[PDB]
Write a protein that binds this DNA or RNA. Structure first.
Ligand SMILES: [Ca+2]
Ligand SMILES: [Ca+2]
Ligand SMILES: [Ca+2]
Ligand SMILES: [Ca+2]
Lengths: 163, 163
DNA sequence: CAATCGTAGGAGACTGGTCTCCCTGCAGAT
DNA sequence: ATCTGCAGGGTCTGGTCCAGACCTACGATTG
């Protein structure tokens, strides 16, 4: 009963669901780096692999990861960064012994009846709250939608149902 | 000691120099995948990790990797792929215990005096052949530039000089 | 630190200037 | 297969193509 869920973006997170119902969710580690004489955020490769090595999740545990489908109206930098975060997470998860399953956001949103929402990120946090009430405190802020995403991805993988 | 050189893109390659002088170079493993109704080539995560784990270079071996820097005039698909390749390789290298050092193409080309060449890819292959004569049979085709790049990036990190 | 808003953008090496560098993706011809 | 050439491009899930859905990065200003 082990499932991992990853929202790989910069504001994303990794969630881990244990057989006994317990869950953990961690903000994606990032660093500030110099690019074209400005500072940009980038996922912290060594920290992520350090995180994944310290999980009690056994090797072979399925990880569900949201696939990057950036909009054509998004800038080239957005396309590069979402590509880069996707690749860094995929390899980190495979190298750590996990079976990787990409999932489009329409898939898990459709499973939880969240498509076409007027406030998708607040609704994401509400759903994760109801599926994981012990993470309620860790979902209070609007900036926590990444923790919720990761949690809903894992819930999707586990087969959980909203009441 | 040991030096790794990686050209990270789809036509790219990984080179490995031993302290004893013997060199190895392998084409980047890739797979065909469906994207938006067409086939696209994509680096093969599990093969890369499988490859890295089979190397004899010890942990802490420095891995020089070519820094992604797509042209602003390149398409957004190009921006995403180079980002993805770059992220998949970095994480793979870190997970295998290597110390990753990103190098701009201008740095290794200037070292070997290859800047502002009208046939850069031919030139790379000729220099790699001079630097690694037993790799001559592996550099004879024009599509082999990636092998040569990887070899020249590694030759840069080892401090080898052209005659 | 937490939120909202608008747009979609190069980056890199040797007191700023100047010059450099790819890649993807798709079609064709042999 | 190898190469040359040229432009810079969404992608996804699901019910013979296509509808209708989905972000993200990167800076600003507000407190
Ligand atoms: Ca998302
Ligand atoms: Ca997110
Ligand atoms: Ca290159
Ligand atoms: Ca290359």
């Amino acid at each position: 009963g082990w499932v991992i869920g990853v929202d790989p973006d910069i504001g994303g997170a990794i969630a881990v669901l244990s057989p006994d119902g317990s869950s953990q969710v961690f903000d994606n580690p990032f660093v500030h780096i110099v690019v074209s004489e400005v500072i940009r955020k980038r996922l912290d490769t060594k920290s992520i692999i350090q995180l994944l090595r310290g999980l009690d999740a056994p090797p072979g545990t399925t990880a569900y990861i949201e696939k990057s489908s950036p909009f054509p109206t998004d800038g080239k930098q957005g396309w590069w960064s979402t590509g880069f975060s996707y690749g860094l997470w995929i390899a980190s998860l495979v190298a750590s012994g996990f079976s990787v399953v990409p999932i489009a956001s329409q898939t898990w949103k459709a499973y939880f009846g969240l498509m076409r929402s007027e406030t998708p990120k607040d609704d994401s946090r509400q759903a994760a709250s109801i599926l994981f009430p012990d993470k309620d405190q860790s979902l209070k802020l609007k900036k926590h939608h990444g923790r919720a995403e990761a949690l809903l991805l894992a819930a999707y993988g586990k087969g959980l149902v909203l009441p």
